[PDB]
Design a protein around this ligand. Structure first.
Ligand SMILES: CCCCCCCC/C=C\CCCCCCCC(=O)O[C@H](COC(=O)CCCCCCCCCCCCCCC)COP(=O)(O)OCCN
Ligand SMILES: CCCCCCCC/C=C\CCCCCCCC(=O)O[C@H](COC(=O)CCCCCCCCCCCCCCC)COP(=O)(O)OCCN
Ligand SMILES: CCCCCCCC/C=C/CCCCCCCC(=O)N[C@@H](COP(=O)(O)O)[C@H](O)/C=C\CCCCCCCCCCCCC
Ligand SMILES: CCCCCCCC/C=C/CCCCCCCC(=O)N[C@@H](COP(=O)(O)O)[C@H](O)/C=C\CCCCCCCCCCCCC
Ligand SMILES: CCCCCCCC/C=C/CCCCCCCC(=O)N[C@@H](COP(=O)(O)O)[C@H](O)/C=C\CCCCCCCCCCCCC
Ligand SMILES: *[C@@H]1O[C@H](CO)[C@@H](O)[C@H](O)[C@H]1NC(C)=O
Ligand SMILES: *[C@@H]1O[C@H](CO)[C@@H](O)[C@H](O)[C@H]1NC(C)=O
Ligand SMILES: *[C@@H]1O[C@H](CO)[C@@H](O)[C@H](O)[C@H]1NC(C)=O
Ligand SMILES: *[C@@H]1O[C@H](CO)[C@@H](O)[C@H](O)[C@H]1NC(C)=O
Ligand SMILES: *[C@@H]1O[C@H](CO)[C@@H](O)[C@H](O)[C@H]1NC(C)=O
Ligand SMILES: *[C@@H]1O[C@H](CO)[C@@H](O)[C@H](O)[C@H]1NC(C)=O
Lengths: 72, 493, 493, 75, 493, 75
């Protein structure tokens, strides 16, 4: 789908409002939220894995966030 | 006086020794310039026009399949062949299908099967490219004449429109009564139309990155193609189904118009219906005020009475506008206008509409001024009958220095290193600052290309955290960290 | 003989003491059941039908905006108001635009603007739900009669068709010459239709997860709706634009049909045009063979000469089909048939077409048999005139046991705990294996729900690595990661 | 977009071939590979950050793979 | 003489070098101004009118429900639909109710139910906003003319009414016999009407904080609304009851008028019935005495006798008033009036009604004076028949100093930093006190916005206790706590 | 209810008497007073909890006063 390769991060943005800017700002943050609420099992498995792999708490939280963001 | 009312209004003060100032004009913004002996000019970039566009490629967004044809082979006999596999009007695919005695085959096993279908685009989107040389920028220059109907007026002929092309990029405008203004613009350095596509879908248009446009996973024709019989990558718009390894069929995928609208998220919409009109982007210009002159500077001051015909009104930038009408004699004359304390001991604020005059007695005059923060008194005319108007300005100078800092930060975010040109007078610190920003803009503009604002926020926090944990390398990464966190908060996508 | 030629073919051997066996019939698959002194039978689930679907929700995928109106309000004076904001057929939005004297506003600042347009659906898709009691499964039961046109024949009336509904646990079929077959199936434990939606879009249809369907970001109507105009979350299909805080516009997003097809990627396509027909999923059945009887169990042996009329052909599962014709006298009679070693000392191969009989002399007989690996003699008829046919079977028992292990693993990857029912004779180890699969599968399903196959592969590599660097935990994590890795390779998406 | 929430991982999969089984198989990995081939400078930075954050080579490679995968998906 | 009798009365004495004095006129207060060779004046802000109010918002305080409709849906079949859900006039709520065979449903479980009713406002309240340039302050300037019916007379035409607006800093009034009074007032800093709403309920009106008014949890319409029916947050005025999950009913809540009277507790009541009239707040004014002259200075002293026609009476501020009638010849003449000790050696008190004159013989004259504390003698007329009237004043300079310090502290509590302008002649210790007050006032206003007086008392005790148990920090916190406690004791809510 | 959000502490008070200044003055004090007399059990539990949470008698008295004031207000 073309929808999976949006026109984001292209360095053509001006002060002019872009096409679906207000909509598409949080759509990925709302999508991940809907998914975590629908699939807590993975988020629980993602926490245990992020705890085990990461040594420091920064690594753990970073691995957890990345895992949770890749999964949906 | 056209700038008055626009929230993206910028005040540029001071010319260089050469009586010039560098300004950047953004679509939707507007610049008010004023130098010591010069008239105040409003500048708005109101139209970017791209002329003589060439189609780069048509993408197919809605297709229909016709003329489905299948061929089969018995197992161990390799792949079957259809005549349509060499016809570029047909999309084809090979699969395997169980064969045996029940299928008319002497052997048992996977036989090759090929399904083809003729591909017909029903709706397409066109991506056009314009050469940088065919751009035409329109700039309107409105002097602060005080004319009655000129405040925030864009539906009139108060200002002078100049056209700027990469060929005739230096042009002069005779501002009637105000001498001549010269604009030396650089229309090749605002937007790089060699890297851009003017993407037209059904009735809407977008300015999009050229490499992203060529990477679109849709069927496409070269711009020269007139028949529509050689669609490249037709498989992006169809799917072949062999549910139970028994029979292959092909179906056209649905219309991709709404998926393309999603795909166009962080792109800027343009107009490609009445010509290719862009109302986005900027133009960097060198404004030459040498031949500018204040109008009516030989006039004597008015000695009659004035009346307020439109009450003082504050604008979004801390300036006030008032419309007064003259009632005395001696028109044309200079309007006595000051902003003073209550005792009229000190001069507290300045004019934006420098040298306000009365051209005709019965024509009201609009005057913009910048009062200090707090209490101040707008004193108009000379006694007897002198107008004294109380005005209070909320805020403080400290908060104004924060708003000015944020407005400059946001400009560097939008314009990058072009922001160093915005009110430049050609100093060494500006050249050094712009050169460093061009280099950090290259190292940053390559590391963060293709990344969303959330990914910028995350990386900004990660980078900041590494800096807070490891002093030379620590301050450097926290700076990159907090600049990345700012650019993630400021970017639109 | 209908199973012969299908690659997804299973052989279920033996019944329980109560003369039953449990089978799971999948769409696109086929089960061949054999038992001592029972006729061989072929079972195919060829149709699942859903009746009386209720509409759960319509979604708009293509809309049209009309009647666009707008209203403004001067700054500090609150919200603008359109009369259309009272009607929910109108999609509306409140934004801010710059205001000032040039806009007919005595004040400067951000004023309220409201844009409303009438939203009208052009194309919608419907989600339908069916009650499990309204399912009907069609099973075709074809015996191994050896009839001339029966090998892999899914068109003729060789087999018996039976309907399995929840309204009767017992389905009986009279197979002429074979007695009666009794099947007790589980039409409520196949696909869980209480968790599923029958999604019909333009001319295609999919079986989808019900909660996924209720989370689709499109404008929707409840299935109970009759007006067809009060769409919920119309904003998912429109976009308002305020490019420079000067004017607010609204435009409908394009057709989302193509995007829905991308959304439908990992779902199963079904039919809903003329009846709700599903050709996916499984049916667990208990096959009762007690009333089955070998056809021509009471025939004497053929003593005359046979001739091969279609040469031995190997199927994908290592069995061989041959068609022979009786030339002798005494029809109907029982064909002498044996697979022997090269010494003609041991019988090495079992029949699949058990008790092959000649019914009419001039009607040839198809005989499927499973020879051993290596060389063997297919012996047909009695002496004199005995046919002695050489056959070599490639492979080995070691390779077959590995292929049986993978088919078993793949059946578990698809059926889950139901795979323990597949050739089940009610044994105590199978009920234990099923119960442990149900608890491990429930836990595994909660932890890997929603993730794609690439994520399961990543997680499998991660968990296997945490076990390889760990103890009893080291064999547990390596087992869990390896099964996870296998399931990521096996799952379609 | 609905295309952002595809019907993957729902537990309804049978032996029947799903709607876009071929495309829904390697599209994401091809999208990641096309993205890296268009944005090598982020991949260099992600590699640099992964190495800095990870204390072990397993963590670093896991952080790198996730950052590289997350970035074209977050768009 | 209009101030004489007002408890909230202030004596401002002395002018600056520029012959001006800053005063703050409050509603319900009054200021008497004195200067060496100037007439004594009384100043009262008596009316603040707001003109041309725009409606910011209407709020429904009493509604009714009609046309109640309901619709149910079987479990698992989604949501019920009522057509009224499309009309925003209707308030609607979705809930769940037990469904089953008794309810006419084929399934058991929670089925969706929707209830809708038509919402109609019966009574609403409107909040209006006025621009600061549409304020008109009425000040009455009353000279101490000694006129017979002038003392405390607010119902007569004794003073001169002047209208202070933002349209003119300078207001000038002719005082017949006293020259001209010039007032340059500050109408744009009395109240911040850009932060205020004029709230009108049934027959009463309040001046309310704009953000408080915009946060009121009631159904509302924009001030732009003209239909009167598309009420926002209607559910604030209705309740849906589903007590036993059998049935959903909707009922309207009672009149919120009394509940709104509780909400308006700390607000100040105004008059919006016949024009927006405010009798609350203050006006800062600079009083220019350049053109003020005493009246009747070219008269000779009276020679005849005086008789006391209204005995000496003390005011609440330690001044005295007396009414005398001239019995002699030579009117108009100056009244001989001193306050002396018993020996008539030392002059002990001063006149408030400076240069008292008889304008007409039969017209008695009211004379205000400030006697010393203790024994004083009021000498009226000359011999023969000179009145000598003993007066005793209770109190002391120490008690008057403390009461002055409490009146000044009370003025700071009410006016904030504006209190520093109250008798200001322009000193630098008044300029520094005012600027420091603006700083500590902004930090205090931000820290105690929204808390009641009992919370101010709690925090004051807590901060005092922190300071008491802390040397430099101890004094700085005990002081903040003590001032916080004083302000908590003085604030009305 | 609107009655729960009174126009108190808004910084618009003048010397003019406000709408229910005498009324509103001690309502909250009288309201807390009646509540303690109707619910003395909670006030004991509040006193016990305050003594336990706080280390110093200033902490303990403050926690008791705040807990006694919050109890009839969260209602
Ligand atoms: C492990 C070796 C198990 C050998 C085996 O039984 O093969 C298959 C069992 O395979 C498995 O259980 C998967 C085991 C994975 C090995 C790791 C039989 O599969 P089936 O046809 O579904 O069962 C019907 C039997 N009547
Ligand atoms: C010690 C300060 C005593 C003092 O100055 O009295 C008053 C000042 O009071 C204060 O400053 C409060 C000081 C609090 C100390 C306790 C005068 O205030 P005013 O009535 O507004 O006078 C204005 C000029 N006409
Ligand atoms: C607090 C943080 C706010 C500070 C904002 C700093 C301004 C940086 C904004 C900026 O220029 N961002 C980027 C704009 O890119 P684009 O407009 O798409 O071509 C910029 O090109 C890339 C990296 C930021 C480099 C900023 C270096 C400033 C150099 C100053 C020379 C001394
Ligand atoms: C080396 C290769 C590893 C062979 C993997 C063994 C087969 C695993 C297949 C399997 O059971 N998949 C899953 C099927 O679930 P679904 O189709 O979505 O309803 C299964 O539910 C999840 C995890 C597998 C747990 C294995 C259960 C075995 C219990 C044995 C008790 C005796
Ligand atoms: C014994 C204790 C009596 C202490 C009385 C101190 C007077 C403070 C009165 C006061 O200014 N209160 C407040 C009035 O609030 P609002 O009228 O609603 O804006 C005020 O704005 C906030 C804090 C008062 C800070 C006191 C400023 C002192 C200036 C020092 C310059 C010498
Ligand atoms: C497609 O089908 C139509 C109708 O049968 C036929 O006229 C046409 O020639 C076909 N085209 C091809 C390329 O086979
Ligand atoms: C803008 O200028 C034109 C030209 O005179 C005038 O007709 C029009 O009324 C002006 N508009 C405003 C809003 O002042
Ligand atoms: C929409 O516009 C059409 C065009 O004439 C008009 O007939 C119709 O009444 C409009 N609808 C509404 C709801 O105003
Ligand atoms: C299938 O069986 C039917 C029924 O007699 C027969 O007519 C047909 O020829 C058979 N087809 C094959 C391929 O054997
Ligand atoms: C409401 O009910 C009245 C009868 O009481 C009826 O006449 C009217 O048409 C109804 N209105 C709506 C909008 O249902
Ligand atoms: C106030 O003055 C008016 C005007 O002369 C007079 O009629 C009235 O009686 C006076 N009232 C008092 C109480 O002095």
């Amino acid at each position: 789908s073309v929808a999976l390769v949006p026109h984001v991060g292209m360095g053509l943005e001006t002060r002019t409002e872009t096409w679906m800017s207000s909509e598409g700002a949080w759509k990925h943050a709302q999508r991940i939220e809907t998914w975590v609420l629908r699939h807590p099992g993975f988020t629980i498995m993602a926490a245990i894995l992020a705890y085990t792999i990461g040594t420091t708490y920064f690594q753990r939280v970073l691995i957890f966030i990345l895992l949770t963001a890749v999964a949906p | 006086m056209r700038c008055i009312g626009i929230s993206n209004r910028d005040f540029v003060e001071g010319v260089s020794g050469g009586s010039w100032v560098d300004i950047v004009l953004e679509h939707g913004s507007c610049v008010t310039t004023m130098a010591k002996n010069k008239p105040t000019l409003d500048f708005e970039l109101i139209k970017t026009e791209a002329k003589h566009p060439a189609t780069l490629r048509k993408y197919c967004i809605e297709a229909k399949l016709t003329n489905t044809t299948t061929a089969s082979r018995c197992p161990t006999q390799g792949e079957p062949s259809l005549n349509e596999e060499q016809d570029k009007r047909f999309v084809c695919k090979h699969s395997m299908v169980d064969r045996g005695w029940g299928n008319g085959c002497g052997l048992f096993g996977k036989g090759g099967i090929v399904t083809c279908a003729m591909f017909t685009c029903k709706k397409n989107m066109e991506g056009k490219v314009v050469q940088p040389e065919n751009l035409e920028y329109t700039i309107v220059i409105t002097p602060h004449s005080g004319e009655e109907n000129a405040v925030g007026n864009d539906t009139g002929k108060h200002g002078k429109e100049i056209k700027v092309t990469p060929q005739s990029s230096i042009t002069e405008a005779e501002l009637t009564g105000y001498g001549t203004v010269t604009m030396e613009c650089s229309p090749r350095t605002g937007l790089d139309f060699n890297e851009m596509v003017l993407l037209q879908m059904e009735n809407k248009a977008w300015l999009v990155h050229r490499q992203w446009f060529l990477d679109l996973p849709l069927p496409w024709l070269p711009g020269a193609d007139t028949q529509g019989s050689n669609w490249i990558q037709k498989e992006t718009l169809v799917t072949f189904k062999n549910p139970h390894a028994k029979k292959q069929d092909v179906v056209v995928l649905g219309s991709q118009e709404g998926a393309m609208h999603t795909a166009l998220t962080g792109a800027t919409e343009i107009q490609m219906s009445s010509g290719n009109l862009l109302f986005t982007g900027h133009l960097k210009c060198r404004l030459r005020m040498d031949k500018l002159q204040l109008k009516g500077m030989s006039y004597s001051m008015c000695t009659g009475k004035f009346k307020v015909v439109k009450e003082i009104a504050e604008t979004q930038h801390g300036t006030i506008v008032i419309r007064v009408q003259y009632e005395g004699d001696g028109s044309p004359c200079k309007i006595p206008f000051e902003i003073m304390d209550l005792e009229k001991r000190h001069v507290l604020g300045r004019l934006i509409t420098v040298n306000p005059i009365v051209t005709e007695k019965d024509s009201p005059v609009n005057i913009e001024a910048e009062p200090p923060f707090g209490d101040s008194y707008i004193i108009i005319g000379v006694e007897p009958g002198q107008l004294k108007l109380s005005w209070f300005k909320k805020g403080s100078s400290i908060g104004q220095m924060f708003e000015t800092t944020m407005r400059g930060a946001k400009r560097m975010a939008i314009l990058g290193d072009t922001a160093w040109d915005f009110g430049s007078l050609g100093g060494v610190f500006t050249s050094i600052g712009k050169a460093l920003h061009q280099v950090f803009g290259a190292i940053y503009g390559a590391a963060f290309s293709g990344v969303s604002w959330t990914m910028k926020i995350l990386i900004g926090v990660v980078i900041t955290w590494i800096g807070m944990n490891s002093t030379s390398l620590s301050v450097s990464l926290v700076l990159v960290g907090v600049v990345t966190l700012y650019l993630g908060v400021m970017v639109q996508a």
